[PDB]
């Protein structure tokens, strides 16, 4: 469904049938609520505990097809542009793509073959570095986030006497906002995520109805406006 | 009651158990027009009952109800407020409309006389068409007649437009006015005119005329304003 259909069925589901009908929502408000509902839905469906099914990214066909249009593959750029201080002397710093929402798969291609990057926790890092070896298992590499400015910088730890040729990252692209109409105005240009032009929902049509329902629920919680509704509907932001 | 009976029994009631016939004709014509309005509006009468609210009210307006067709106003190329509005002229002898229907290719559709507030409300929504068995109607630029815009759903053509309405009553005249009174007319007719209404409401028309006469002749401002309340 295109943006006009988002807005028309938003109006239908919000106030065109309600008995003591409420004021219609302005297009900026509808775009804001739709973008919020989109992000909430993405976060709810990525995490199993966030939805009533207990199903995350790839726990069912529907969850695969939900994020299928939001998956992207890119590469981390070696961060030798400027000097820096790494926590580990034997780690190579890489910069992830700017439009990164969530990392789901990483791999590094070295001279000793491809290796799956395992994101190790800080307590896990301490445990592993208290051991005599201090290097990954055969077909794996280690990873920790380092000092990041304006984009995520990442330290890749591989086994000794190994060089990294490329660093691929299969991630979830940051969703683009849903903007119903050109938000340009003479009184001031308002933006949802830095863009005023019309922006279609760049995800699969399977969850457009879900985004619409969530947006309507958020609109009605805003209309109710007491602390109660804000608190319970803020639980699903996550 | 014949007009002679109206004139004779006006004298019985007004002249203390026994006015010009023009003055009697004027008051009787005014009285019936009051009575039709008062018994049409439920709040205008003493029972709180309108046109179809009781058997008596149905026989009251029985001989005024008329069914006529609207004629397309294609002769005059005027300007309509709605894009898909077809201008139609209503019958000349029209007093109050009570049912309107339009026969389209899709089917007969009951016309809803839509208020100026509801139009702005229903035209601020996505679709902007009536429900599947209804049509809208709003009055438009009218010259010496009644013109109505029939806003039926797009993708449909209007083939017929039936109007069921209350006909304008004819005047009550008790004598040839031109015989003694030079060129006086009541509603454009100078000759004897009978009551075109059911005999059930002749007594109330006569009683109202007598009350109107006595209040008019008493001359008090309070009486004139008090009985002028029931003029609507």
Q: Are A26 and A181 in contact (CB under 8 A)?
A: no
Q: Collapse the DSSP code of B40 into the 3-class scheme (helix H, G, I; strand E, B; otherwise coil) and give the result.
A: helix
Helix (H) or strand (E) holding A157: strand A153-157
CA distance A115 to A136: 10
The three-class DSSP label of residue B213 is helix
Radius of gyration of chain B (CA): 22
Contacts of A12 in chain B (CB under 8 A): 126
**In B, which residues are within 8 Å of A26 by CB distance?**
none
Interface test with B, best of A16, A17, A27 (most B CBs within 10 A): A16
Q: Which of A10, A33, A30, A1 is nearest to A204 (CA)?
A: A1
For chain A, how big is the Rg over CA atoms in Å? 22
What is the rounded distance in angstroms from the CA atom of residue A180 to the CA atom of residue A3?
Answer: 5
CA-wise closest residue to B27 among B171, B219, B179, B221? B171
Report which of B95, B222, B111 is spatially closest to residue B166, judged by C-alpha positions: B95
**Helices A3-11, A27-46: inter-axial angle, 10-degree rounding:** 100
Element of type H or E holding A229: helix A227-233
DSSP 3-state percent helix, strand, coil across chain B (nearest 5): 35, 20, 40
Distance from CA of B118 to the nearest CA of A (A): 13
Q: Establish if B125 touches chain A: CB-CB under 8 angstroms.
A: yes
What phi-psi label fits residue B202: left (phi over 0), alpha (psi between -120 and 50 degrees) or beta? alpha
> At what resolution in Å was this solved?
3.2
Contact state of A16 with B124 under an 8 Å Cβ cutoff: no
Say whether residue B126 is in contact with chain A using an 8 A CB cutoff: yes
């Amino acid at each position: 469904m295109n943006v006009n259909e988002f807005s028309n069925e938003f109006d239908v589901l919000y106030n065109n049938i309600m008995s003591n009908a409420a004021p219609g929502l302005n297009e900026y408000e509808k775009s804001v609520l739709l973008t919020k509902a989109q992000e909430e839905i993405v976060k709810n469906y990525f995490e199993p505990a966030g939805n009533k099914y207990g199903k995350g990214l790839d726990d069912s066909p529907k969850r695969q097809i939900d994020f299928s249009e939001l998956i992207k593959v890119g590469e981390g750029v070696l961060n030798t542009s400027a000097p820096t201080i790494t926590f580990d002397k034997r780690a190579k710093v890489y910069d992830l793509p700017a439009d990164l929402f969530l990392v789901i798969n990483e791999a590094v291609d070295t001279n000793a073959g491809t290796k799956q990057i395992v994101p190790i926790s800080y307590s896990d890092y301490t445990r592993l570095m208290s051991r005599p070896y201090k290097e990954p298992v055969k077909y794996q590499a280690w990873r920790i986030i380092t000092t990041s400015i304006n984009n995520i910088s990442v330290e890749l730890i591989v086994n000794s006497n190994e060089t990294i040729t490329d660093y691929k990252v299969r991630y979830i692209r940051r969703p683009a906002p849903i903007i119903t109409t050109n938000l340009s105005s003479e009184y001031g240009d308002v933006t949802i995520n830095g863009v005023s032009t019309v922006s279609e929902c760049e995800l699969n049509p399977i969850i457009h109805s879900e985004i619409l329902q969530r947006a309507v629920e958020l609109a009605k919680a805003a209309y109710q406006g007491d602390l109660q509704a804000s608190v319970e509907l803020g639980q699903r932001s996550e």
